[PDB]
Amino acid sequence: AVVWDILDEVIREHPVLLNRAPTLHRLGIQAFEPVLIEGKAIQLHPLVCA
Amino acid sequence: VLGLYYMTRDCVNAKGEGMVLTGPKEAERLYRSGLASLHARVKVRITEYE
Amino acid sequence: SVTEFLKPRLVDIEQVSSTHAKVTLEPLERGFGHTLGNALRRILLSSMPGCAVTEVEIDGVLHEYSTKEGVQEDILEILLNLKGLAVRVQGKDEVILTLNKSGIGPVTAADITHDGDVEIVKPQHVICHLTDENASISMRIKVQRGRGYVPASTRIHSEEDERPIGRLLVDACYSPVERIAYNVEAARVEQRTDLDKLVIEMETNGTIDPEEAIRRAATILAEQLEAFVDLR
Amino acid sequence: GSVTEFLKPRLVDIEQVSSTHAKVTLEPLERGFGHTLGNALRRILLSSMPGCAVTEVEIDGVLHEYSTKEGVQEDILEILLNLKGLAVRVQGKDEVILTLNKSGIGPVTAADITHDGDVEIVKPQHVICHLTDENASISMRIKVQRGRGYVPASTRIHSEEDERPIGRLLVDACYSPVERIAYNVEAARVEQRTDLDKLVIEMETNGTIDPEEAIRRAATILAEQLEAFVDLR
Amino acid sequence: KPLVGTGMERAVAVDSGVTAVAKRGGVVQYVDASRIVIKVNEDEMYPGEAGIDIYNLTKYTRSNQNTCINQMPCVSLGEPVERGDVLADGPSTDLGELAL
Amino acid sequence: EIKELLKLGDLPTSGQIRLYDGRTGEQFERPVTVGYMYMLKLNHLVDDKM
């Protein structure tokens, strides 16, 4: 579990890029600051999903 | 959008129509306490800025 | 043991002001945050005992829209100001106060007839503006101790239709809370990620600090429950 | 007057229509108190109630749940599903072992389970399997324990029991004995006093838990949680 | 079963190969988790035949898309069975009706 | 015929019922359509794609 603590420490300010094929226009790739959830689905904010 | 539309639509007759609220906080209270429905038309004291 | 439950820590309080404050709890079991927040909001809104101003009488007034010269604001505006009057009485549950003034400018609660049993918390509050000299305002207002909230259409009755010319009615916002909100979020401990973390945002008039109000609400609910808990 | 005071509720009446179906009444309650109390009670009752459940099964001659036995009508998976439905009360132990032996053609029912004097099978009519040959026989051991909520078998094995044997099987444990809760509120008549309410709660549960103990336990938990609020600085 | 069906479920479930259908009428003599033994009635059996038919169910096997394939009996000892009856359900079948 | 079947079933004729929100214990002002539906799982499980 110390690995989980380290993992929570590392990403605290580490943006990641989300991409949806096809990337029709440049909005198709965007940057987000992650939050860690159990499960296996990536969770988006609906507004940007539009 | 559906929620906002419902929230702002008024009706001719509703619970507590015509009363006067000294501030939007009291409007929120009267709604949450269930003594007036959202659609009821009322006079309210409001501050705005420019 | 099955009886185990993760009691929360009073993880923080953040006072934006004497009236405005936030209180946060972490962690709580799944679904406990919602029930506790909902129950507290209910009790604060509908059952908190308070002292409020309910009637006003003015000699030249028969109805809420009775015209009056000299005063800057309308009668309904002064009614709203009275509704906003922050007042607490420690003595009798029913008190009558009088205000009489002739002066250009604001009519603050500082000019009410003071009494040792009653504290106006915010004397700086303005009831109205009186536009001119040789113009006077004279009123009597009635303050009462009650529980919850009562609007005008609720208090009016045919059993109390025997009213004189000079009687007006004000909504008695006894419960001193001005706003209660709570929101629920996720928190993690012991590699568990199925937990409730709770945030409460609160505004109340200057009668009491919000912490005191929350403690009072908790005590009320516990005293309600007490007849059931056979445990120590 | 007495605006600062309150009346207090009590369990003025309790009624039982069946081993599973029960009705409880609280009186008197002040205005608005009824709904908040009913909502809190429903929440806590659904979530928290301690329960007794079936966790481990061991059957001779069976190595895994997907196999099949000679004489049983249903597959092993079906009989595990049947056992998951079992409801049982245990008093003296935090975990207990149950034993079953049957032979000969016919249904096998919880009545055939061999039990200790501290174990109550609520509904022996609950079938488990059918034996369809005279020489067919079934002989099994069951492990029963007490816990809150619901725990999947995945996290159960994630508890990392050292040296897991081969011939023992794991199922999900739905400990919670409460199945449905409803509350209703109506105008009271106590001493002809106004603004009083009578609250009623109806519940369907496994015949395990006592309704009165259930409500007292729920109120206990709620008061305990509120105590942390009482302390706040 | 699906509550709001279309009647077609019977034909599709029987016509597919997954379900075991009663090729010869009679009375079900024996059943277990995997074997079905049926006594053919006196009139239906041919001269010189043993008058008994047996079926073996595909208990568990890899489907062509990794799903399970299982056959479960849905009759009990001594129940009469009729020509074209469904003795054993297959995947997503209950009492011979499609059960997706 | 649907209405007749419902009427014999003692359910509301419109098929809408009143409903209470469990999370607060209050009542939705609008009636809601509650019924029974037939649902499938589509063999695109998340753990096969993550």
Side-chain angles (χ1 to χ4, degrees), chain C residues 7-13 23-26, chain D residues 228 231-233:
Chain C
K7 65 165 298 301
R9 58 167 293 175
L10 188 68
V11 68
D12 64 53
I13 303 93
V23 171
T24 63
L25 292 189
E26 182 180 326
Chain D
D231 177 50
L232 68 84
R233 310 283 72 78

Side-chain angles (χ1 to χ4, degrees), chain E residues 61-76:
Chain E
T61 179
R62 178 171 184 263
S63 70
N64 217 29
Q65 272 80 11
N66 313 320
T67 78
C68 163
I69 285 173
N70 191 343
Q71 289 170 310
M72 305 173 291
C74 56
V75 301
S76 298

Side-chain angles (χ1 to χ4, degrees), chain D residues 19-68:
Chain D
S19 60
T20 63
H21 187 286
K23 188 188 297 285
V24 175
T25 67
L26 291 310
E27 197 181 56
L29 286 149
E30 298 203 3
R31 308 309 304 276
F33 286 80
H35 303 86
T36 172
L37 262 294
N39 182 253
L41 264 308
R42 177 180 181 275
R43 173 70 50 85
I44 301 304
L45 287 171
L46 284 174
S47 56
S48 311
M49 289 314 299
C52 311
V54 170
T55 279
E56 186 94 54
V57 194
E58 176 179 331
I59 313 180
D60 53 355
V62 185
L63 308 182
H64 59 268
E65 58 280 29
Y66 307 93
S67 180
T68 50

Side-chain angles (χ1 to χ4, degrees), chain C residues 42-144:
Chain C
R42 299 299 303 282
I43 289 302
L44 266 320
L45 261 294
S46 69
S47 182
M48 193 55 51
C51 301
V53 182
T54 172
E55 311 188 38
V56 58
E57 56 256 33
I58 297 179
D59 50 358
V61 177
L62 161 64
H63 43 260
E64 70 287 357
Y65 57 101
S66 303
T67 56
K68 177 55 187 296
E69 71 293 340
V71 58
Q72 202 286 329
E73 301 81 346
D74 60 77
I75 303 305
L76 298 315
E77 204 285 320
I78 88 178
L79 262 288
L80 290 186
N81 299 323
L82 294 175
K83 179 170 178 173
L85 176 56
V87 57
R88 62 185 178 199
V89 56
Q90 59 177 244
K92 299 177 298 297
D93 66 334
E94 182 180 30
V95 181
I96 170 66
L97 306 312
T98 179
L99 162 65
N100 179 37
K101 182 176 180 177
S102 295
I104 297 95
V107 186
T108 54
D111 203 13
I112 197 63
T113 48
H114 306 279
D115 177 283
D117 293 5
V118 57
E119 303 294 345
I120 299 305
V121 185
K122 189 78 62 178
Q124 310 78 356
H125 191 293
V126 179
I127 287 82
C128 68
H129 276 260
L130 182 50
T131 57
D132 293 324
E133 193 51 276
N134 71 82
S136 180
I137 184 169
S138 311
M139 67 171 69
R140 321 191 314 178
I141 64 181
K142 184 180 172 183
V143 69
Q144 177 57 50

